[PDB]
Amino acid sequence: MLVLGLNGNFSAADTDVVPQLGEVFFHDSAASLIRDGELVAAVEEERLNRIKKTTKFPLNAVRECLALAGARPEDVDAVGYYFPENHIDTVLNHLYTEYPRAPLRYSRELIRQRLKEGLGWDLPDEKLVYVPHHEAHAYSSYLHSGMDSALVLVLDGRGELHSGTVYRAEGTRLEKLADYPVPKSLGGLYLNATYLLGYGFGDEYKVMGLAPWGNPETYRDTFAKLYTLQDNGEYELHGNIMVPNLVSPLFYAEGFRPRRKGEPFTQAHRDFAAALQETVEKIVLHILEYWAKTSGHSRLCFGGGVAHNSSLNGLILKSGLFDEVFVHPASHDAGAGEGAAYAAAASLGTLERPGKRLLSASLGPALGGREQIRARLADWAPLIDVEFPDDAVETAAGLLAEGQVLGWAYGRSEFGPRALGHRSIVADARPEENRTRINAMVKKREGFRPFAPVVTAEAARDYFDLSGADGNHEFMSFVVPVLPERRTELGAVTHVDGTARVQVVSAESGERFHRLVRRFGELTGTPVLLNTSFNNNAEPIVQSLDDVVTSFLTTDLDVLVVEDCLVRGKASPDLGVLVPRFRPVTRLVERRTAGPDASAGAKTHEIHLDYDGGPSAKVSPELYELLGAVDGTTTLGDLAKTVGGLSDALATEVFALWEQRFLTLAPAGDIGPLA
Amino acid sequence: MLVLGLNGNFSAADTDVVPQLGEVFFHDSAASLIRDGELVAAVEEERLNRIKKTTKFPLNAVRECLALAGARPEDVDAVGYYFPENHIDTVLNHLYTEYPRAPLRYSRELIRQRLKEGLGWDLPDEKLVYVPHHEAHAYSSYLHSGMDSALVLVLDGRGELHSGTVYRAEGTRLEKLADYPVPKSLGGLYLNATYLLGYGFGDEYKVMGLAPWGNPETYRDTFAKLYTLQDNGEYELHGNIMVPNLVSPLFYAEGFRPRRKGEPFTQAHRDFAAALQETVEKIVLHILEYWAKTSGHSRLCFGGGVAHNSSLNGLILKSGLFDEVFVHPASHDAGAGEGAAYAAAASLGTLERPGKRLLSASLGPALGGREQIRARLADWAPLIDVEFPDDAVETAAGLLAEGQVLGWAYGRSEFGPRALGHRSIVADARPEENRTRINAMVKKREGFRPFAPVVTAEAARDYFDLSGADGNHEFMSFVVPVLPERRTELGAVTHVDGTARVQVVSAESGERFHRLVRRFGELTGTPVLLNTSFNNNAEPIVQSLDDVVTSFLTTDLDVLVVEDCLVRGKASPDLGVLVPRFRPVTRLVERRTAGPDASAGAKTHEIHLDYDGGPSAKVSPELYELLGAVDGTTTLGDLAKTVGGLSDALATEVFALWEQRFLTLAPAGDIGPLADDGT
Ligand SMILES: NC(=O)OP(=O)(O)OC[C@H]1O[C@@H](n2cnc3c(N)ncnc32)[C@H](O)[C@@H]1O
Ligand SMILES: NC(=O)OP(=O)(O)OC[C@H]1O[C@@H](n2cnc3c(N)ncnc32)[C@H](O)[C@@H]1O
Ligand SMILES: [Fe+3]
Ligand SMILES: [Fe+3]
């Protein structure tokens, strides 16, 4: 029994189903593969097309999943899609009314067209199963918990008819207990409010990181006008008729002004964040307090995109409402895609479930075999120096103890948004200055942002307060208190409120990463590391060896540990040997607007990425000419001869575009099919 | 007391307040000027920036209105804006949360900035008055009716808080009797349905033209699921949580297929339009039957954008409910901008009202003085031949009797969407072939709609069943039956159900145009003309002389009558003497997309108009190089020297871009400041 789970929209690599398809129209595309009830492979399409939270059809992810399972398309017994057919088709039909040139292709036709054109796979109609959206979430969250009965709560922005659903799970059967309508959405509430802070879709966890810097009393009575807690686990959100945003009109009337890009986060902004976070904590705990005592369950599985609110989860853990809580590493819609595989399997026969609680999210493609990795690192030789230590883990522990910030890339990539020891950036957790600098210089992000620690399972209760319910900490699902007597020791990873979104690593969840942290603790006395995701501000978590090396070279990391090779940047790297390539969404434009006296204005030149919310940057006339000659095979140095050789100012301009990922720059060739 | 009324959004000429600001965010921008209670000038900004139903700040409209009144900006005593300040600022604030780079500028500061920078006018805060949206509508509709009191109904998409409002008006006082909430919007219902027909905002009038071709029984029971009529003039529209469109989910579930671009209308499409039109009629007559009985009033004024549904108006007229009905020529948001001026006057002092019922919509800028008009037509000489007949009207009527299709441009442009004898295209109303013929001449694809007839007041009741109430017909507000015995005679202007959107012209409403239609009737025996707006498919109604000549030269009209001059195009017009100028929204682009094997891919050259819904067209590498050299003064022929001369192929390419109005092409210089004609 081999079953594919699918989620996302249906756009091709280089175009969208309608032009500029909004970024929230079926986002976080992914593919998962289950075999005999076990999750054998899963990867988000963002890792492969390099578009964060992409809506494009997860073609590459399907291909990578099949290869990891050693399967052909013809081996797949069924395909589950994470929404009902009538809902996604009605939304497609709506887009087609707004875009009268788009042909009327609905989801079944588009899914089959993508699989046939992109994988040579003719999917028969009877093998495609559409699934209620919150049922898909619930299966994914519950079946990986290792529990044999539980309360299951799903809270997201919306499914087809509901923003929240409550289930009883027993054995492999789900029984719906209750639901909450779409206008009561807590995901929608959090996203509406996120927009007041100059942020957008995907930035909610940044708002969450901002909340502890604020005082929730300032705007508590304002948010109190937007919701009412009612008897027996009910609540209401109070909408308005002015604009499609629950939050902005009231806050505007009280004189709150939305933050602008590039402007500081004021104390009013921080206080706004703190009151928002308190509001959805109050509502969710109200829901759970009622359904815990009503359902009788002592164990909770929590899923849906709202379950990535690590602060909320930590509060649930400390609430005393449950004995055990489980949260999946991919509780957003990528996890619903996996749940749609289990639901499709259930619709066609008995359902097989995982045998054990999931401990590792290392489920994506790996980096390659040892031979091809070493060969590809040799292609990068004009840029990097490579060393092959006898014991890379021992060597990396020492570099960390000496204050180096390390890129760390091993085996299969993490499913879901957290880095957990396979595509990580790691540093000494003790100095508070590491937080200041890794925010400012490495990740190039806001100074208020916290950093998450990883601790060995054996030392976890020496540093963190895990009391209350038994939660699963393998995936940084829970914010927990750092013990007061350890807060000054753990300066880089203790948040302003004394908490940490902790990863507890064990020999079973991540043997190699556990050894790294254990050895570091033997050398320093502190078995705790800072662990942030391996990506710059312009990209999702790195996937391939080329992604890893590109990110290392365009961030300010000290050294890269990749499959036991230590990589350092050459003193003077030769950018000239790199072969530029367009991404499928890369565009180059020479533009004139109107000028004075209704003339044609002066020409300007720009590169941009062609998707909703994609970046753009001005380029010089010289680089515009250079980039127009890109062929995918010719090196940057040779291309540059048509404009008088790779200038130092030209190399610098190209390097800035590379850092922003407007194009692909990498040595000729590629690593080949992954061994 | 000189009061300016404003409506629309706040964008400058060349950018929008947020990029690609949606075409529905405070559209049909306009400026109106009232003086001691009289409307002295009004024009929609679309006529001046040439963007249909534009949302941009009506700066040109304000400048033109002040010039017509002989006023400085500093002479204005108050400015009224057609929405409450908190509502428009909350919408702007919402736009600013979606675009975090936009500076936080709200409506008061933006109004003051545009007026300061555009006119040197420092508007004091106390002179700016913000007005309830449906109140602005009601004042404009009622104060121009000539009525001593009336029931006043406003239906549109939405105001700040309602989609419909009912008032009793008396003297200059308005008293609100009822309202209907935003989600019950009939303007919203109609526009939602319009999208299923492959159309968009501003195409509702086309859907209404299509409805008579359809059988309303096909989808009657489907639409019945979307509304319920209730007691006491109430009704409900049944929404859905699937998508922000009331109509598409249920029709999708029943197998309906939204029409695609360039696809012809199926019978299903025709029937859909017919059931939609029936639906809105049933609901509006349900509202009006209750409020006529409850108010006891025998007179109705009807405004808001829904009041441009002239088939509905015609059915209101034929209902037994009222003795008089009045509809303003600009019942859409441009007229709310007017009504905001009245409300501001009532607020900050006493409200003076118009002396008489409005008979003419000739209220925008004129074409110019007789001498600058002849001076300017001389600049066009390499393209046209001009005659100066003794009596242009007499000549025009003869040409019309011979079968010619004329452009007709006189005086001040019409306020509101209908051409009424000042920016019109006129032809014999009798030949049914003229429908297909004239649609081809202006390159429009609305052969399924008949054109609208204009008739003299004296003959009106010889041709049209005006019975029922007394409606005002000076603005084509009512669809009325064409008398059976006259239907085959009026072949170009009679619809498949026997109806027509009639303009009745009188010596009082438009002296010149009345004389023209009268004279034509003396020569032919039929004192009825076809009258359609003077614009091709790519522009609003022409405004200036240059607009008029440009439109004449880019359509296949036989002859142009403009201010007593007879204009015809030369055989072989010399396009090279035209000076190209970018419009503020013109963009010229060379583009590379991604190619196979991750190469830099297909290279293309394009021109487009940078606004939501703006057109675009491919251009050749040679024309790209020529257009990039446009300086606003050098002629097309001289610019073309830099790429080898103006070849027949290049001139053909440019002409097609001219037809689509991607740039301005006209002789060097301009007509100069419009002459103070002494009126
Ligand atoms: N079907 C569907 O809606 O997709 P989905 O399961 O992937 O969840 C997305 C929703 O989670 C909300 N969300 C994401 N992170 C969140 C956070 N830290 N706190 C609250 N809500 C959050 C987000 O704002 C958005 O409303
Ligand atoms: N504030 C505000 O909403 O603007 P507004 O007063 O200018 O009216 C616009 C509304 O009239 C509706 N509308 C326009 N023409 C229409 C027609 N022939 N039939 C029905 N509705 C129409 C149109 O679909 C739109 O919903
Ligand atoms: Fe979801
Ligand atoms: Fe309106």
- For A273, the enclosing helix (H) or strand (E) is helix A267-295
| Helices B133-143/B333-347 angle, 10° precision | 90
Using DSSP bridges, classify how beta strands A299-303 and A324-326 pair: parallel, antiparallel or unpaired: parallel
Query: Which of B97, B581, B587 is opposite residue A591, by nearest beta carbon?
Result: B587
DSSP letters for A600-641? BPPPEEEEEE-STT--EEE--HHHHHHHHT--SSS-HHHHHG
* Burial class of B252 by CB neighbour count within 10 A (0 to 12, 13 to 18, 19+): buried
Q: How far apart are CA A95 and CA A217, in angstroms?
A: 42
Q: CB within 8 A of A648, min separation 6: which ones?
A: none
The three state secondary structure string of B184-239 is HCHHHHHHHHHHCCCCCCCCHHHHHHHHHHCCCHHHHHHHCCCEEECCCCCEEECC
Residue whose CA is at the smallest distance from ligand 2 atom 7? B332
Q: CB within 8 A of A75, min separation 6: which ones?
A: A2, A66
Ligand nearest to the CA of A340: 3
Q: How far apart are CA B141 and CA A67, in angstroms?
A: 70
| Helices B85-98/B107-119 angle, 10° precision | 90
Rg (CA), chain A: 25
Q: How far is CA B612 from CA A92, A222, A601, A650, B90, in A?
A: 21, 36, 21, 36, 21
Residue whose CA is at the smallest distance from ligand 1 atom 16? A306
Closest by CA position to A667, among listed A577, A541, A558: A577
B433 in the same domain as B289: no
**CA nearest A627 in B: which residue?**
B600
Q: How far apart are CA A574 and CA A567, in angstroms?
A: 16
CA B124 from chain center: how many Å? 32
Resolution of the coordinates in A? Answer: 2.0
In a 3-state reduction of DSSP, which class is residue A7?
strand
Compute the C-alpha angle B507/B509/B515, nearest 5°.
Answer: 35
Using DSSP bridges, classify how beta strands B30-35 and B2-7 pair: parallel, antiparallel or unpaired: antiparallel
H and E: helices and strands count for chain A: 21, 28
Using DSSP bridges, classify how beta strands B565-569 and B384-387 pair: parallel, antiparallel or unpaired: antiparallel
Ligand nearest to the CA of A307: 1
CB contact under 8 A, B628 and A592: yes
B318 in the same domain as B370: no
Does the CA dihedral A517-A520-A524-A529 come out positive or negative?
A: negative
Length of chain B: 679
Give the pair of three-digit tokens for residue B116. 């300061």
B162 phi and psi angles, rounded to 5 deg: -140, 160
B84 phi and psi angles, rounded to 5 deg: -60, 145
Give the pair of three-digit tokens for residue A518. 């254990």
Contact in structure between A15 and A26 (CB atoms under 8 Å):
no
For residue A113, the CA-to-ligand 3 centroid distance in Å is 25
Q: How far apart are CA B77 and CA B66, in angstroms?
A: 12
B318 in the same domain as B368: no
Q: How far apart are CA B511 and CA B505, in angstroms?
A: 8
Q: How far apart are CA B430 and CA B450, in angstroms?
A: 12
Q: How far apart are CA A204 and CA A210, in angstroms?
A: 10
CB contact under 8 A, A632 and B259: no
- The DSSP letter of residue B538 is T
CATH code, domain carrying A499: 3.90.870.20
Contact in structure between A198 and A263 (CB atoms under 8 Å):
yes
Q: How far apart are CA B671 and CA A193, in angstroms?
A: 53
Q: Which amino acid is at B408?
A: W
List Cβ<8 Å contacts ≥24 apart for B204-209. B204/B308, B204/B309, B205/B308, B205/B417, B206/B446, B206/B449, B207/B273, B207/B276, B207/B277, B208/B273, B208/B277, B208/B309, B208/B310, B208/B311, B209/B446, B209/B448, B209/B449, B209/B450, B209/B495
Q: CB within 8 A of A572, min separation 6: which ones?
A: none
Torsion over CA of A590, A594, A600 and A602, rounded to 10 degrees?
Answer: -50
Q: How far apart are CA B82 and CA B154, in angstroms?
A: 14
Sequence-ordered alpha helix ranges (H) in A308-456: 310-318, 333-348, 370-379, 392-401, 432-437
- The DSSP letter of residue B448 is T
In a 3-state reduction of DSSP, which class is residue B555?
coil
Task: Provide the annotated binding site of B.
Answer: 26-27, 133, 137, 156-158, 187, 204, 305, 309, 333
- Which residues of chain A make contact with B584, given a CB cutoff of 8 A? 594, 598
Ligand 1 and A191: CB distance under 6 A: yes
Closest by CA position to B245, among listed A94, A172, A200: A94
Q: Which domain holds residue A428?
A: 364-569
Question: What is the CB neighbour count within 10 angstroms for residue A649?
Answer: 11
CB contact under 8 A, B597 and A632: yes
- For A136, the enclosing helix (H) or strand (E) is helix A133-143
- Which residues of chain A make contact with B582, given a CB cutoff of 8 A? 593-595, 598-601
Closest by CA position to A161, among listed B662, B240, B384: B240
Torsion over CA of B198, B204, B209 and B215, rounded to 10 degrees?
Answer: 70
Q: How far apart are CA B28 and CA B34, in angstroms?
A: 19
Torsion over CA of B471, B473, B479 and B484, rounded to 10 degrees?
Answer: 100
Task: Provide the annotated binding site of A for Fe(3+).
Answer: 133, 137, 156, 333
Query: Which of B97, B195, B583 is opposite residue A245, by nearest beta carbon?
Result: B97
B370 in the same domain as B323: no
List Cβ<8 Å contacts ≥24 apart for A222-231. A222/A250, A222/A251, A222/A254, A222/A275, A223/A275, A223/A276, A223/A278, A223/A279, A225/A250, A226/A189, A226/A250, A226/A279, A227/A189, A227/A279, A227/A283, A229/A282, A229/A283, A229/A286
Using DSSP bridges, classify how beta strands B38-44 and B30-35 pair: parallel, antiparallel or unpaired: antiparallel
Ligand 1 and A29: CB distance under 6 A: no
Question: What is the CB neighbour count within 10 angstroms for residue A378?
Answer: 11
Residue whose CA is at the smallest distance from ligand 2 atom 18? B309
B477 in the same domain as B423: yes
CA B60 from chain center: how many Å? 17
Q: How far apart are CA A603 and CA A601, in angstroms?
A: 6
* Burial class of A373 by CB neighbour count within 10 A (0 to 12, 13 to 18, 19+): buried
B325 in the same domain as B417: no
Q: How many CA atoms are closer than 13 Å to the CA of A639, on its beta-carbon side?
A: 28
CA B458 from chain center: how many Å? 28
For residue A219, the CA-to-ligand 3 centroid distance in Å is 29
Q: How far apart are CA A520 and CA A10, in angstroms?
A: 46
Q: How far apart are CA B651 and CA B666, in angstroms?
A: 14
Using DSSP bridges, classify how beta strands B149-155 and B162-170 pair: parallel, antiparallel or unpaired: antiparallel
Torsion over CA of A457, A462, A464 and A467, rounded to 10 degrees?
Answer: 90
Cross-strand pairs, A426 = A406, A531
Contact in structure between B258 and B265 (CB atoms under 8 Å):
no
DSSP letters for B296-341? --SEEEEESGGGG-HHHHHHHHHSSS-SEEE--S--SHHHHHHHHH
Cross-strand pairs, A505 = A456
- The DSSP letter of residue A350 is P
Contact in structure between A93 and A139 (CB atoms under 8 Å):
no
CA B349 from chain center: how many Å? 32
CATH code, domain carrying B187: 3.30.420.40
Chain A closest CA to B395's CA: distance in Å? 39
Q: How far apart are CA A443 and CA B584, in angstroms?
A: 41
CB contact under 8 A, B592 and A628: yes
Closest by CA position to A423, among listed A569, A563, A570, A583: A563
Closest by CA position to A361, among listed A472, A241, A218, A274: A472
Torsion over CA of A36, A41, A43 and A45, rounded to 10 degrees?
Answer: -80
CA A1 from chain center: how many Å? 29
Query: Which of A183, A598, A627 is opposite residue B581, by nearest beta carbon?
Result: A598
Q: How far apart are CA B436 and CA A656, in angstroms?
A: 59
CA A383 from chain center: how many Å? 29
The three state secondary structure string of A228-263 is EEECCCEEEECCCCCCCCCCHHHHHHCCCCCCCCCC
Closest by CA position to A541, among listed A380, A404, A407, A368: A407
Torsion over CA of A622, A624, A626 and A631, rounded to 10 degrees?
Answer: 180
Q: How far apart are CA B150 and CA B170, in angstroms?
A: 7
Ligand 1 and A308: CB distance under 6 A: yes
Residue whose CA is at the smallest distance from ligand 2 atom 3? B157
- Which residues of chain A make contact with B260, given a CB cutoff of 8 A? 100-104
Give the pair of three-digit tokens for residue A617. 């940057």
Residue whose CA is at the smallest distance from ligand 1 atom 9? A305
CB contact under 8 A, A261 and B101: yes
Q: How far apart are CA A49 and CA A183, in angstroms?
A: 33
Q: How far apart are CA A135 and CA A273, in angstroms?
A: 31
In a 3-state reduction of DSSP, which class is residue B83?
coil
Question: What is the CB neighbour count within 10 angstroms for residue A289?
Answer: 14
Q: How far apart are CA B218 and CA A405, in angstroms?
A: 71
Contact in structure between A409 and A542 (CB atoms under 8 Å):
yes
Max Cα separation, chain B?
A: 76
Give the pair of three-digit tokens for residue B269. 């499409």
Only one residue has tokens 């359609």, namely B532
- For B39, the enclosing helix (H) or strand (E) is strand B38-44
Q: Which residues of A497-529 are buried (b: 16+ CB within 10 A; e: fewer)?
A: eebbbbbbbbeebbebbbbbbbbbbeeeebbbb
For residue B364, the CA-to-ligand 4 centroid distance in Å is 21
Question: What is the CB neighbour count within 10 angstroms for residue B63?
Answer: 17
Closest by CA position to A338, among listed A365, A310, A368, A361: A361
Contact in structure between A492 and A482 (CB atoms under 8 Å):
no
Q: How far apart are CA B477 and CA B313, in angstroms?
A: 7
Contact in structure between A582 and A657 (CB atoms under 8 Å):
no
Query: Which of B100, B258, B592 is opposite residue A587, by nearest beta carbon?
Result: B592
What atom of ligand 1 comes closest to residue A303's alpha carbon? Answer: 6
In this structure, the residues whose C-beta lies within 6 A of any atom of ligand 2 are B 28, 156-158, 187-188, 190-191, 204-205, 208, 304-306, 308-309, 332-333
Cross-strand pairs, A30 = A7, A44
Using DSSP bridges, classify how beta strands B499-501 and B423-428 pair: parallel, antiparallel or unpaired: unpaired
Query: Which of B241, B252, B629 is opposite residue A600, by nearest beta carbon?
Result: B629
Q: CB within 8 A of A488, min separation 6: which ones?
A: none
Ligand 1 and A190: CB distance under 6 A: yes
B453 in the same domain as B395: yes
DSSP letters for B153-179? EEESS--SSEEEEEEEEETTEEEEEEE
Q: How far apart are CA A362 and CA B363, in angstroms?
A: 72
Q: Which amino acid is at A275?
A: A
Give the pair of three-digit tokens for residue A511. 């043997």
Q: How far apart are CA A273 and CA A453, in angstroms?
A: 23
- For B519, the enclosing helix (H) or strand (E) is helix B511-524
B330 in the same domain as B370: no
Give the pair of three-digit tokens for residue A623. 């680089």
Question: What is the CB neighbour count within 10 angstroms for residue B496?
Answer: 10
**CA nearest B201 in A: which residue?**
A98
Ligand nearest to the CA of B328: 2
Q: How far apart are CA A602 and CA B353, in angstroms?
A: 51
Rg (CA), chain B: 25
Q: How far apart are CA A178 and CA A164, in angstroms?
A: 8
For residue A308, the CA-to-ligand 1 centroid distance in Å is 8
Give the pair of three-digit tokens for residue A6. 């699918």
